[PDB]
Amino acid sequence: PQITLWQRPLVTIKIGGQLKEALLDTGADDTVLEEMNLPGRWKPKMIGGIGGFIKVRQYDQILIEICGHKAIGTVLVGPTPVNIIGRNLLTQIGCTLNF
Amino acid sequence: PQITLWQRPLVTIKIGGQLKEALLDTGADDTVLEEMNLPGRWKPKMIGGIGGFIKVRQYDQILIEICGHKAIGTVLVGPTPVNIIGRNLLTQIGCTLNF
Ligand SMILES: CC(C)CN(C[C@@H](O)[C@H](Cc1ccc(F)cc1)NC(=O)O[C@H]1[C@H]2CO[C@H]3OC[C@@H]1[C@H]3C2)S(=O)(=O)c1ccc2nc(NC(C)C)oc2c1
């Protein structure tokens, strides 16, 4: 799809058997999702944003289907206010900015 | 330009007579710039992000030239870690996401 930016660029994702909405976020290096149940091993990580830092769990080689396109990569899980799809996964679905 | 997302989507901006770099950020509703000298009246505002909230100064009808495209709108100035161009200005330069 082409997506204009008059509204938040939200898409449906399927991850860990669950359906969620997430923001396509070109300002995010990495993918950060709200607390959710994910299977397997993880590693503690601190990440920074506009108002300071949060502690997240780092999960590698996680499958995510983003608006019907499959990607596999790192997902960070923690107290983010919104689910964010970052460039680590946007590059896999072929996402570009155009003006 | 078409911009792929293997690197941060940074562009040159000119605002308040100054040259700066800023991130084209589809996950940002509003435009937030690092402390800088802007002329005229402003209004206190608190905005929230990944790690909590920051106090910004709200400036309206500010001219910004974003990668050679002119836009006029609200700019928030405050302790953001990075200069962010949000959807309020991305819609004016015709920016879209495509996959
Ligand atoms: C969380 C997200 C929903 C909104 N944020 C835009 C994201 O793109 C921000 C932009 C950004 C902020 C700080 C920073 F150091 C680097 C980049 N990205 C973000 O938090 O990403 C984090 C995390 C993602 O992976 C890595 O890449 C950058 C770091 C790092 C951890 S925001 O907090 O910066 C933001 C920006 C503009 C806004 N305008 C508003 N307006 C409200 C009044 C609605 O809220 C805003 C909130």
Side-chain angles (χ1 to χ4, degrees):
Chain A
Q2 179 169 254
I3 300 176
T4 57
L5 292 171
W6 303 98
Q7 303 288 331
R8 293 182 180 226
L10 301 162
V11 296
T12 60
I13 67 168
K14 183 173 182 188
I15 182 178
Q18 293 167 68
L19 312 174
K20 297 177 180 296
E21 291 205 327
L23 185 64
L24 301 173
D25 188 356
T26 59
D29 294 345
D30 300 320
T31 292
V32 193
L33 298 188
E34 296 198 73
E35 187 63 49
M36 73 171 287
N37 177 19
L38 275 193
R41 205 147 302 287
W42 55 267
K43 293 171 181 305
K45 211 202 192 203
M46 326 231 67
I47 62 174
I50 241 177
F53 286 80
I54 60 159
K55 301 66 58 253
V56 299
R57 310 190 307 273
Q58 176 173 336
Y59 295 85
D60 305 328
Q61 195 75 356
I62 297 303
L63 165 72
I64 176 160
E65 186 152 5
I66 300 160
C67 192
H69 283 72
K70 290 178 202 136
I72 289 188
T74 302
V75 171
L76 313 179
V77 180
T80 173
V82 297
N83 299 317
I84 288 145
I85 308 305
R87 295 189 296 100
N88 77 298
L89 299 183
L90 298 173
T91 54
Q92 293 192 47
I93 69 172
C95 195
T96 60
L97 279 173
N98 306 258
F99 67 92
Chain B
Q2 179 169 254
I3 300 176
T4 57
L5 292 171
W6 303 98
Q7 303 288 331
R8 293 182 180 226
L10 301 162
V11 296
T12 60
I13 67 168
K14 183 173 182 188
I15 182 178
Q18 293 167 68
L19 312 174
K20 297 177 180 296
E21 291 205 327
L23 185 64
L24 301 173
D25 188 356
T26 59
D29 294 345
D30 300 320
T31 292
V32 193
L33 298 188
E34 296 198 73
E35 187 63 49
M36 73 171 287
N37 177 19
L38 275 193
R41 205 147 302 287
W42 55 267
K43 293 171 181 305
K45 211 202 192 203
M46 326 231 67
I47 62 174
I50 241 177
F53 286 80
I54 60 159
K55 301 66 58 253
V56 299
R57 310 190 307 273
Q58 176 173 336
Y59 295 85
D60 305 328
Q61 195 75 356
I62 297 303
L63 165 72
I64 176 160
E65 186 152 5
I66 300 160
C67 192
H69 283 72
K70 290 178 202 136
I72 289 188
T74 302
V75 171
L76 313 179
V77 180
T80 173
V82 297
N83 299 317
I84 288 145
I85 308 305
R87 295 189 296 100
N88 77 298
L89 299 183
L90 298 173
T91 54
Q92 293 192 47
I93 69 172
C95 195
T96 60
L97 279 173
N98 306 259
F99 67 92

PDB file of all heavy atoms in Angstrom, chain B residues 31-56:
ATOM      1  N   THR B  31       6.167  18.018  15.492  1.00  0.00           N
ATOM      2  CA  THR B  31       7.594  18.309  15.204  1.00  0.00           C
ATOM      3  C   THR B  31       8.273  18.823  16.477  1.00  0.00           C
ATOM      4  O   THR B  31       7.692  19.749  17.114  1.00  0.00           O
ATOM      5  CB  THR B  31       7.678  19.287  14.035  1.00  0.00           C
ATOM      6  OG1 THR B  31       7.220  18.588  12.879  1.00  0.00           O
ATOM      7  CG2 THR B  31       9.092  19.785  13.822  1.00  0.00           C
ATOM      8  N   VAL B  32       9.362  18.225  16.895  1.00  0.00           N
ATOM      9  CA  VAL B  32      10.047  18.501  18.176  1.00  0.00           C
ATOM     10  C   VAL B  32      11.519  18.717  17.854  1.00  0.00           C
ATOM     11  O   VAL B  32      12.176  17.806  17.410  1.00  0.00           O
ATOM     12  CB  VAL B  32       9.862  17.395  19.233  1.00  0.00           C
ATOM     13  CG1 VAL B  32      10.326  17.884  20.605  1.00  0.00           C
ATOM     14  CG2 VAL B  32       8.422  16.911  19.293  1.00  0.00           C
ATOM     15  N   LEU B  33      12.030  19.915  18.186  1.00  0.00           N
ATOM     16  CA  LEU B  33      13.433  20.231  17.961  1.00  0.00           C
ATOM     17  C   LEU B  33      14.165  20.505  19.268  1.00  0.00           C
ATOM     18  O   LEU B  33      13.495  20.977  20.223  1.00  0.00           O
ATOM     19  CB  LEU B  33      13.464  21.482  17.096  1.00  0.00           C
ATOM     20  CG  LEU B  33      12.839  21.369  15.705  1.00  0.00           C
ATOM     21  CD1 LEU B  33      13.168  22.657  14.980  1.00  0.00           C
ATOM     22  CD2 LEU B  33      13.365  20.179  14.917  1.00  0.00           C
ATOM     23  N   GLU B  34      15.449  20.155  19.271  1.00  0.00           N
ATOM     24  CA  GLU B  34      16.398  20.353  20.396  1.00  0.00           C
ATOM     25  C   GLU B  34      16.439  21.843  20.718  1.00  0.00           C
ATOM     26  O   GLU B  34      16.035  22.696  19.892  1.00  0.00           O
ATOM     27  CB  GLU B  34      17.795  19.826  20.067  1.00  0.00           C
ATOM     28  CG  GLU B  34      17.901  18.320  19.843  1.00  0.00           C
ATOM     29  CD  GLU B  34      19.350  17.827  19.966  1.00  0.00           C
ATOM     30  OE1 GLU B  34      19.889  17.773  21.109  1.00  0.00           O
ATOM     31  OE2 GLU B  34      19.951  17.526  18.938  1.00  0.00           O
ATOM     32  N   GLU B  35      16.860  22.178  21.936  1.00  0.00           N
ATOM     33  CA  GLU B  35      16.892  23.597  22.320  1.00  0.00           C
ATOM     34  C   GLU B  35      17.603  24.369  21.218  1.00  0.00           C
ATOM     35  O   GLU B  35      18.723  23.959  20.765  1.00  0.00           O
ATOM     36  CB  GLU B  35      17.640  23.899  23.615  1.00  0.00           C
ATOM     37  CG  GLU B  35      17.478  25.365  24.036  1.00  0.00           C
ATOM     38  CD  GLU B  35      16.034  25.729  24.333  1.00  0.00           C
ATOM     39  OE1 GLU B  35      15.392  24.957  25.087  1.00  0.00           O
ATOM     40  OE2 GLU B  35      15.521  26.725  23.760  1.00  0.00           O
ATOM     41  N   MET B  36      16.946  25.431  20.823  1.00  0.00           N
ATOM     42  CA  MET B  36      17.445  26.325  19.777  1.00  0.00           C
ATOM     43  C   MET B  36      16.768  27.667  20.011  1.00  0.00           C
ATOM     44  O   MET B  36      15.765  27.704  20.721  1.00  0.00           O
ATOM     45  CB  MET B  36      17.065  25.828  18.380  1.00  0.00           C
ATOM     46  CG  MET B  36      15.591  26.027  18.085  1.00  0.00           C
ATOM     47  SD  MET B  36      15.233  25.683  16.347  1.00  0.00           S
ATOM     48  CE  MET B  36      15.984  27.135  15.591  1.00  0.00           C
ATOM     49  N   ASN B  37      17.364  28.700  19.433  1.00  0.00           N
ATOM     50  CA  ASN B  37      16.938  30.111  19.515  1.00  0.00           C
ATOM     51  C   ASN B  37      15.854  30.363  18.463  1.00  0.00           C
ATOM     52  O   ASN B  37      16.233  30.429  17.243  1.00  0.00           O
ATOM     53  CB  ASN B  37      18.159  30.999  19.247  1.00  0.00           C
ATOM     54  CG  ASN B  37      17.832  32.480  19.239  1.00  0.00           C
ATOM     55  OD1 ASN B  37      16.788  32.884  19.770  1.00  0.00           O
ATOM     56  ND2 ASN B  37      18.720  33.286  18.658  1.00  0.00           N
ATOM     57  N   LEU B  38      14.591  30.551  18.875  1.00  0.00           N
ATOM     58  CA  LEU B  38      13.485  30.902  17.933  1.00  0.00           C
ATOM     59  C   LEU B  38      12.893  32.240  18.357  1.00  0.00           C
ATOM     60  O   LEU B  38      12.809  32.533  19.547  1.00  0.00           O
ATOM     61  CB  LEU B  38      12.388  29.831  17.913  1.00  0.00           C
ATOM     62  CG  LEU B  38      12.569  28.624  16.986  1.00  0.00           C
ATOM     63  CD1 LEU B  38      11.258  27.851  16.868  1.00  0.00           C
ATOM     64  CD2 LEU B  38      13.086  29.011  15.604  1.00  0.00           C
ATOM     65  N   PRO B  39      12.499  33.100  17.398  1.00  0.00           N
ATOM     66  CA  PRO B  39      11.936  34.403  17.730  1.00  0.00           C
ATOM     67  C   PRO B  39      10.457  34.242  18.094  1.00  0.00           C
ATOM     68  O   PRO B  39       9.849  33.316  17.569  1.00  0.00           O
ATOM     69  CB  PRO B  39      12.096  35.171  16.412  1.00  0.00           C
ATOM     70  CG  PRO B  39      11.857  34.112  15.368  1.00  0.00           C
ATOM     71  CD  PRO B  39      12.505  32.862  15.942  1.00  0.00           C
ATOM     72  N   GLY B  40       9.940  35.132  18.951  1.00  0.00           N
ATOM     73  CA  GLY B  40       8.496  35.388  19.107  1.00  0.00           C
ATOM     74  C   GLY B  40       7.875  34.690  20.307  1.00  0.00           C
ATOM     75  O   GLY B  40       8.629  34.168  21.148  1.00  0.00           O
ATOM     76  N   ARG B  41       6.536  34.695  20.351  1.00  0.00           N
ATOM     77  CA  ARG B  41       5.698  34.211  21.473  1.00  0.00           C
ATOM     78  C   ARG B  41       5.692  32.674  21.447  1.00  0.00           C
ATOM     79  O   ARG B  41       5.859  32.107  20.371  1.00  0.00           O
ATOM     80  CB  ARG B  41       4.281  34.787  21.342  1.00  0.00           C
ATOM     81  CG  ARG B  41       3.518  34.873  22.659  1.00  0.00           C
ATOM     82  CD  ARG B  41       2.577  36.064  22.737  1.00  0.00           C
ATOM     83  NE  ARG B  41       3.286  37.324  22.541  1.00  0.00           N
ATOM     84  CZ  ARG B  41       4.101  37.894  23.425  1.00  0.00           C
ATOM     85  NH1 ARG B  41       4.323  37.326  24.601  1.00  0.00           N
ATOM     86  NH2 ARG B  41       4.698  39.037  23.129  1.00  0.00           N
ATOM     87  N   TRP B  42       5.516  32.039  22.597  1.00  0.00           N
ATOM     88  CA  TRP B  42       5.373  30.564  22.712  1.00  0.00           C
ATOM     89  C   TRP B  42       4.488  30.252  23.910  1.00  0.00           C
ATOM     90  O   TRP B  42       4.189  31.193  24.666  1.00  0.00           O
ATOM     91  CB  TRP B  42       6.739  29.929  22.855  1.00  0.00           C
ATOM     92  CG  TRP B  42       7.519  30.490  23.995  1.00  0.00           C
ATOM     93  CD1 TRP B  42       8.413  31.518  23.950  1.00  0.00           C
ATOM     94  CD2 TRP B  42       7.471  30.054  25.359  1.00  0.00           C
ATOM     95  NE1 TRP B  42       8.956  31.725  25.187  1.00  0.00           N
ATOM     96  CE2 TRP B  42       8.395  30.848  26.075  1.00  0.00           C
ATOM     97  CE3 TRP B  42       6.771  29.049  26.037  1.00  0.00           C
ATOM     98  CZ2 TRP B  42       8.620  30.679  27.443  1.00  0.00           C
ATOM     99  CZ3 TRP B  42       6.990  28.886  27.390  1.00  0.00           C
ATOM    100  CH2 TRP B  42       7.893  29.696  28.080  1.00  0.00           C
ATOM    101  N   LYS B  43       4.099  28.985  24.057  1.00  0.00           N
ATOM    102  CA  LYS B  43       3.123  28.476  25.066  1.00  0.00           C
ATOM    103  C   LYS B  43       3.678  27.184  25.642  1.00  0.00           C
ATOM    104  O   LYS B  43       4.153  26.340  24.875  1.00  0.00           O
ATOM    105  CB  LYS B  43       1.766  28.142  24.452  1.00  0.00           C
ATOM    106  CG  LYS B  43       0.951  29.305  23.914  1.00  0.00           C
ATOM    107  CD  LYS B  43      -0.266  28.839  23.145  1.00  0.00           C
ATOM    108  CE  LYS B  43      -1.109  29.959  22.572  1.00  0.00           C
ATOM    109  NZ  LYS B  43      -1.528  30.910  23.630  1.00  0.00           N
ATOM    110  N   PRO B  44       3.690  27.015  26.986  1.00  0.00           N
ATOM    111  CA  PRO B  44       4.235  25.814  27.619  1.00  0.00           C
ATOM    112  C   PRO B  44       3.381  24.600  27.240  1.00  0.00           C
ATOM    113  O   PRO B  44       2.215  24.745  26.990  1.00  0.00           O
ATOM    114  CB  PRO B  44       4.177  26.087  29.129  1.00  0.00           C
ATOM    115  CG  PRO B  44       3.928  27.562  29.253  1.00  0.00           C
ATOM    116  CD  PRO B  44       3.210  27.986  27.987  1.00  0.00           C
ATOM    117  N   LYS B  45       4.024  23.452  27.057  1.00  0.00           N
ATOM    118  CA  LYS B  45       3.335  22.206  26.645  1.00  0.00           C
ATOM    119  C   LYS B  45       4.131  21.047  27.235  1.00  0.00           C
ATOM    120  O   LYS B  45       5.338  21.182  27.368  1.00  0.00           O
ATOM    121  CB  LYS B  45       3.262  22.130  25.120  1.00  0.00           C
ATOM    122  CG  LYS B  45       2.051  21.418  24.552  1.00  0.00           C
ATOM    123  CD  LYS B  45       2.270  20.899  23.137  1.00  0.00           C
ATOM    124  CE  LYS B  45       0.994  20.457  22.456  1.00  0.00           C
ATOM    125  NZ  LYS B  45       1.273  19.484  21.370  1.00  0.00           N
ATOM    126  N   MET B  46       3.448  19.966  27.595  1.00  0.00           N
ATOM    127  CA  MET B  46       4.121  18.720  28.023  1.00  0.00           C
ATOM    128  C   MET B  46       3.758  17.710  26.957  1.00  0.00           C
ATOM    129  O   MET B  46       2.604  17.669  26.594  1.00  0.00           O
ATOM    130  CB  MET B  46       3.594  18.122  29.327  1.00  0.00           C
ATOM    131  CG  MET B  46       3.140  19.085  30.351  1.00  0.00           C
ATOM    132  SD  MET B  46       3.987  18.600  31.829  1.00  0.00           S
ATOM    133  CE  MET B  46       5.656  18.997  31.315  1.00  0.00           C
ATOM    134  N   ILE B  47       4.724  16.935  26.502  1.00  0.00           N
ATOM    135  CA  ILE B  47       4.492  15.878  25.479  1.00  0.00           C
ATOM    136  C   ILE B  47       5.114  14.577  25.966  1.00  0.00           C
ATOM    137  O   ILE B  47       6.109  14.607  26.732  1.00  0.00           O
ATOM    138  CB  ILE B  47       5.037  16.259  24.096  1.00  0.00           C
ATOM    139  CG1 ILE B  47       6.551  16.456  24.135  1.00  0.00           C
ATOM    140  CG2 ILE B  47       4.298  17.460  23.539  1.00  0.00           C
ATOM    141  CD1 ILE B  47       7.161  16.700  22.784  1.00  0.00           C
ATOM    142  N   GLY B  48       4.503  13.455  25.592  1.00  0.00           N
ATOM    143  CA  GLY B  48       4.949  12.159  26.116  1.00  0.00           C
ATOM    144  C   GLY B  48       5.561  11.276  25.049  1.00  0.00           C
ATOM    145  O   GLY B  48       5.103  11.307  23.919  1.00  0.00           O
ATOM    146  N   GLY B  49       6.508  10.460  25.462  1.00  0.00           N
ATOM    147  CA  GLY B  49       7.146   9.513  24.550  1.00  0.00           C
ATOM    148  C   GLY B  49       7.483   8.230  25.249  1.00  0.00           C
ATOM    149  O   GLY B  49       6.953   7.974  26.292  1.00  0.00           O
ATOM    150  N   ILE B  50       8.457   7.531  24.723  1.00  0.00           N
ATOM    151  CA  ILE B  50       8.762   6.192  25.270  1.00  0.00           C
ATOM    152  C   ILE B  50       9.075   6.154  26.774  1.00  0.00           C
ATOM    153  O   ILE B  50       8.484   5.266  27.437  1.00  0.00           O
ATOM    154  CB  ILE B  50       9.728   5.431  24.351  1.00  0.00           C
ATOM    155  CG1 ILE B  50       9.090   4.144  23.845  1.00  0.00           C
ATOM    156  CG2 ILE B  50      11.060   5.162  24.992  1.00  0.00           C
ATOM    157  CD1 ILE B  50       9.951   3.411  22.891  1.00  0.00           C
ATOM    158  N   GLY B  51       9.869   7.081  27.306  1.00  0.00           N
ATOM    159  CA  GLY B  51      10.349   7.007  28.702  1.00  0.00           C
ATOM    160  C   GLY B  51       9.744   8.000  29.686  1.00  0.00           C
ATOM    161  O   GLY B  51      10.205   8.091  30.797  1.00  0.00           O
ATOM    162  N   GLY B  52       8.736   8.709  29.274  1.00  0.00           N
ATOM    163  CA  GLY B  52       7.991   9.690  30.076  1.00  0.00           C
ATOM    164  C   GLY B  52       7.737  10.956  29.290  1.00  0.00           C
ATOM    165  O   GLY B  52       7.583  10.920  28.056  1.00  0.00           O
ATOM    166  N   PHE B  53       7.696  12.092  29.984  1.00  0.00           N
ATOM    167  CA  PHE B  53       7.188  13.375  29.441  1.00  0.00           C
ATOM    168  C   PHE B  53       8.268  14.465  29.504  1.00  0.00           C
ATOM    169  O   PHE B  53       9.059  14.505  30.451  1.00  0.00           O
ATOM    170  CB  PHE B  53       5.923  13.798  30.187  1.00  0.00           C
ATOM    171  CG  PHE B  53       4.694  12.997  29.831  1.00  0.00           C
ATOM    172  CD1 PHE B  53       4.472  11.749  30.394  1.00  0.00           C
ATOM    173  CD2 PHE B  53       3.757  13.484  28.924  1.00  0.00           C
ATOM    174  CE1 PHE B  53       3.345  11.014  30.064  1.00  0.00           C
ATOM    175  CE2 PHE B  53       2.642  12.728  28.573  1.00  0.00           C
ATOM    176  CZ  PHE B  53       2.439  11.497  29.150  1.00  0.00           C
ATOM    177  N   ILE B  54       8.246  15.361  28.524  1.00  0.00           N
ATOM    178  CA  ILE B  54       9.117  16.565  28.526  1.00  0.00           C
ATOM    179  C   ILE B  54       8.247  17.804  28.408  1.00  0.00           C
ATOM    180  O   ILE B  54       7.189  17.761  27.762  1.00  0.00           O
ATOM    181  CB  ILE B  54      10.201  16.495  27.436  1.00  0.00           C
ATOM    182  CG1 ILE B  54       9.631  16.378  26.018  1.00  0.00           C
ATOM    183  CG2 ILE B  54      11.166  15.387  27.788  1.00  0.00           C
ATOM    184  CD1 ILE B  54      10.601  16.814  24.946  1.00  0.00           C
ATOM    185  N   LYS B  55       8.765  18.899  28.963  1.00  0.00           N
ATOM    186  CA  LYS B  55       8.194  20.256  28.856  1.00  0.00           C
ATOM    187  C   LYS B  55       8.816  20.881  27.601  1.00  0.00           C
ATOM    188  O   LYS B  55      10.042  20.795  27.491  1.00  0.00           O
ATOM    189  CB  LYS B  55       8.570  21.110  30.080  1.00  0.00           C
ATOM    190  CG  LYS B  55       8.152  20.624  31.470  1.00  0.00           C
ATOM    191  CD  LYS B  55       8.814  19.324  31.991  1.00  0.00           C
ATOM    192  CE  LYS B  55      10.337  19.342  32.078  1.00  0.00           C
ATOM    193  NZ  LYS B  55      11.026  18.531  31.028  1.00  0.00           N
ATOM    194  N   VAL B  56       7.988  21.366  26.704  1.00  0.00           N
ATOM    195  CA  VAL B  56       8.432  22.042  25.450  1.00  0.00           C
ATOM    196  C   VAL B  56       7.813  23.437  25.349  1.00  0.00           C
ATOM    197  O   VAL B  56       6.795  23.747  26.058  1.00  0.00           O
ATOM    198  CB  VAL B  56       8.081  21.171  24.235  1.00  0.00           C
ATOM    199  CG1 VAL B  56       8.790  19.826  24.308  1.00  0.00           C
ATOM    200  CG2 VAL B  56       6.587  21.005  24.068  1.00  0.00           C
TER     201      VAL B  56
END
